[PDB]
Amino acid sequence: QFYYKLSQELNGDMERVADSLVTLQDQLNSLAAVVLQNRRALDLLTAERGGTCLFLGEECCYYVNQSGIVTEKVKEIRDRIQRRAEELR
């Protein structure tokens, strides 16, 4: 009875966490496409100056997309919630 309740409490919290993680990654994917397009525009505008980084006289900053990691963790979390929901039923 207490195992049933706590398992349901954990699943309800984790469902909300998994939805938030997906949404945070979705916004990062959305924002990064705008940022990378902005960089491409800056590289063309400063082409004669060797692009953005040479124009500023700095080391280049590159974006490291790690979306597949968060996608995989969310899939594992959702599998665990589903396995626990089935154990109950």
Place this chain on the structure above:
Amino acid sequence: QFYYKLSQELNGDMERVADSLVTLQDQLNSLAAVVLQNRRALDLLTAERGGTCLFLGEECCYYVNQSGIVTEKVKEIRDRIQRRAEELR
């Protein structure tokens, strides 16, 4: 006794998760305002070329703000922690 302990363990973890989710969304909100201002500047600098996208000769990337989703999930999580803390007291 074990139900009391596990309920407290879950609430402590979830409080920390909810704080992190809020903070990740806050940083995304903060970063997106800088990115959108950067895009507006690029659109003005390339106005004669039809703006950023026509200047690059690409399909436009737009940002999809989904802050309200994460805000809502965090509010539900915090309500669930509070309901459980009250059940204990």
Place this chain on the structure above:
Amino acid sequence: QFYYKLSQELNGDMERVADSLVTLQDQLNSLAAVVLQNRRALDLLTAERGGTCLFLGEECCYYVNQSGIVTEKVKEIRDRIQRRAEELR
């Protein structure tokens, strides 16, 4: 027996959540460095116009980096998982 199982269920979920939080913050750190470099390039390109914000005729958008907050919450979560794993063994 039920306390052992639920404690293991919570640790498995939270390990995955903590990994996702770190990864979301890592991508935000990575993206912000590209965005801030983009802003520096725009400030130099619009120097005669007083920089990006004066060029657009807008209030300046600044990025509020809160990485240390998420790093700290992840460290506390991982400490809690480890304390619980030890309580079991």
